[PDB]
Write a protein that binds this ligand. Structure first.
Ligand SMILES: N[C@@H](CCC(=O)N[C@@H](CS)C(=O)NCC(=O)O)C(=O)O
Ligand SMILES: N[C@@H](CCC(=O)N[C@@H](CS)C(=O)NCC(=O)O)C(=O)O
Lengths: 238, 238
């Protein structure tokens, strides 16, 4: 129950203690899952405040004028928002092996792959508006077109992951939307992208991914409530 | 006439010579102007190939599957696309003073300001669809709302530029859309953002900005042709 979200009327939280960083998150948010994957991969000590996105604390707009999660806050009071920005900040500001390559071109390549991926999150949006079997057929084709872009990268690189044989930043940035494909009944969208399908299996074996994976039933529970603007959606299961 | 664009039927260009980097550009493209501002600011030796965006060379899709400018190609044959990615690559891969700060938080701040700016380019799109004085009134209000986000940054920082008292990466990334405000008759959109208006004047004084500024009449010439899918638009004046 420590994971229960803070919503409208909640007290503004106190300062982040020295030695920790804080993430403002939501347990079912794929953008915030990026940040949490990086926190875990790098072994960064942190605390989590979940935000009720359907009933937000007024004070949360002081953390991020956009009112979105994720947001990082450190002990110096610095605030960083936008998931990709938070992930890049964590990789740069904390020790351990880098998730981003040092080489400028290879770093640019990871960013270009993120661009290739970048239509997917909004499509997991087209999904909400799909209301029947005709819409569903069209939706699957939209996903297949984007997945083909990604398949081509793996085809030429012939590597296990998008940045090489070792899992790296770009894999964690795109993973949360693939995690949810099964629950969305879009897992057939990778049947004509065989390397991408194998990549999904390799990702599920990663210790960091595995530790943060949410079950289909749990995400289903969240989605049913979320689609109705339920103030209880973010706290599903608690 | 060396600046004349390459279009459909043109021969694929040869390798980039050692010691130079090549940009695939278009003289009136604000995204490519970002890259060219960085090339100039850092004193990077380069060549330019302008692409006829209304009559593209087929081979250009081998440089960028998206078929957009800008694109960088170096002597090793590496290809980098997306303007922000090209700019970050240049800052990292070439010597001279950095345009991006070394500090991870301050770098993240520049990226967050880019996010605050990020609706503007599409609005210079809403502008195309504005066909009368009513549309124009609505368009100006859209710009004013976004400019207020930027004004707030300057208000708290109380610095000459968005990254400090010295011009830096973020200023060059947002400048090309402000350059064009006069020609679009949107220069009144900054009259209630006084620090932003002063920033525009400071930018025009910058040696790099000044060297690459295009006159209103020239951009007007381009726009008139561009709005009709003219194969001659990109080569206006040549
Ligand atoms: N571009 C943002 C998107 C973040 C985002 O959209 N987060 C959602 C939850 S997964 C949110 O906070 N939604 C609340 C809202 O839209 O009001 C990022 O990359 O961090
Ligand atoms: N997101 C790209 C946008 C680049 C872009 O849109 N460039 C335009 C010209 S300013 C282009 O190439 N247009 C050709 C087209 O749309 O087909 C970037 O940041 O580089």
């Amino acid at each position: 129950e420590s994971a229960r979200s803070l919503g409208k009327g909640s007290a503004p939280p106190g300062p982040v203690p020295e030695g920790s960083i804080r993430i403002y998150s939501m347990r079912f948010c794929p953008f915030a899952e990026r940040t949490r994957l990086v926190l875990k991969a790098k072994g960064i000590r942190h605390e989590v405040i979940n935000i009720n996105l359907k009933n937000k604390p007024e004070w949360f707009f002081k953390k991020n004028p956009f009112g979105l999660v994720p947001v990082l806050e450190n002990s110096q009071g610095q605030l960083i928002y936008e998931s990709a920005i938070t992930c890049e900040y964590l990789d740069e500001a904390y020790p351990g092996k880098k998730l981003l390559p040092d080489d400028p071109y290879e770093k640019a390549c990871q960013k270009m792959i993120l661009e290739l991926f970048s239509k997917v999150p909004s499509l997991v949006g087209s999904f909400i508006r799909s209301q029947n079997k005709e819409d569903y057929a069209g939706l699957k084709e939209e996903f297949r077109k984007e997945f083909t872009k990604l398949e081509e990268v793996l085809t030429n690189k012939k590597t296990t992951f998008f940045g090489g044989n070792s899992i790296s930043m770009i894999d964690y940035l795109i993973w949360p939307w693939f995690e949810r494909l099964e629950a969305m009944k879009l897992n057939e969208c990778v049947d004509h992208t065989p390397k991408l399908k194998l990549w999904m299996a390799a990702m599920k074996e990663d210790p960091t991914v595995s530790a943060l994976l949410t079950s289909e039933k749990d995400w289903q529970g969240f989605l049913e409530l979320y689609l109705q603007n339920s103030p209880e959606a973010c706290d599903y299961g608690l």
